[model samples]
Target: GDTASLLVENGRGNTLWPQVVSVLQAKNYTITQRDDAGQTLTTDWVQWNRLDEDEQYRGRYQISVKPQGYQQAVTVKLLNLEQAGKPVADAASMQRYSTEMMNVISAGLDKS
Candidate 1:
């Protein structure tokens, strides 16, 4: 459980932009709650991502999207990885997952 926050340009007060959610969902992240006003979103702690890049040691416990004065504020963090029946954990795998997610998000932002 670590802090993973990113502030990117072009928030435009949008909390539920299709591209934003699409990118994460495409990576196997399941949406739990998403504010209609486009202010915040949360993802489940478990997923069965079949991406070749995933090492199976990482999980996105939760994610949040917020408006930050014209910027898109995103927060993503590790799952308990401690939960029973959950995937294992390792420092490297988590870091890799985080980086990959950010890249996917960046791609979405770039397209928008």
Candidate 2:
């Protein structure tokens, strides 16, 4: 099924978090930490960690959510790889690749 492949898609960088949180809040979803026993927190205090090695040149963010009744997780990863000279063909191509990679990586996780 497509259950494992679902993730929060953020096509932009850290600038999108506030909007994301607003949408999630409107839908009654609770943004929270990874811990199960702790209380849920607002998205404003949430911090994104960059996975890429070049910090000064580019920016990246990871947004996660743990919705009830679903064992699967949701994440939104925003990358500024082109600013790091990672060369994307164009804006359209960058978006295409980002979405494709996200689906591929998410699907790959199910196998692991």
Candidate 3:
């Protein structure tokens, strides 16, 4: 599946990463793995496209968050996703998700 790589400027994964993990956790995403140095995190989550009222249930989704470096921009990647289930989602949905994720990371970096 095609991946989504969102670059967030002035990002800090040390803290922002955990915050993101928290968000996903709250959203019911299962944490599959994480890097020892906290540079990356993976989860078995799912995506829903509200725009497509006819959309079906997605099989499964996995995501990876990687910090470029300390005090630098980080990237959020859509590692794995279901095929048929995700087709109904509009492209704008992806951008919105990216922005939301970046928003939190950026906010964390700002207060850090």
**Which candidate achieves the best lDDT against the true structure?**
1
TM-score of each: 0.60, 0.31, 0.55
Which candidate do you rate higher for TM-score, 1 or 2? 1
User: In candidate 1, residue 79 scores what lDDT?
Assistant: 51
Ranking under TM-score, best-scoring first?
1, 3, 2
Model 3, 1-112: lDDT tens per residue?
A: 2344555455544566666666767666667787746557665645454564454434333334555655444665544334454443555655555454455445555655
Model 2 RMSD vs true structure: 12.6
Candidate 3 Cα deviation (angstroms), residue 51 = 3.7
The per-residue C-alpha lDDT of model 2 at residue 89 equals 45
lDDT of 2 by residue, 1-112 (tens): 1112234333322223344444546544445532323312232221223464343333232344444342434444444434444544465634543443345334434333
Q: Give candidate 1's TM-score.
A: 0.60
Residue clash pairs of candidate 2: none
Question: Model 1 misses residue 95 by how many Å?
Answer: 3.5
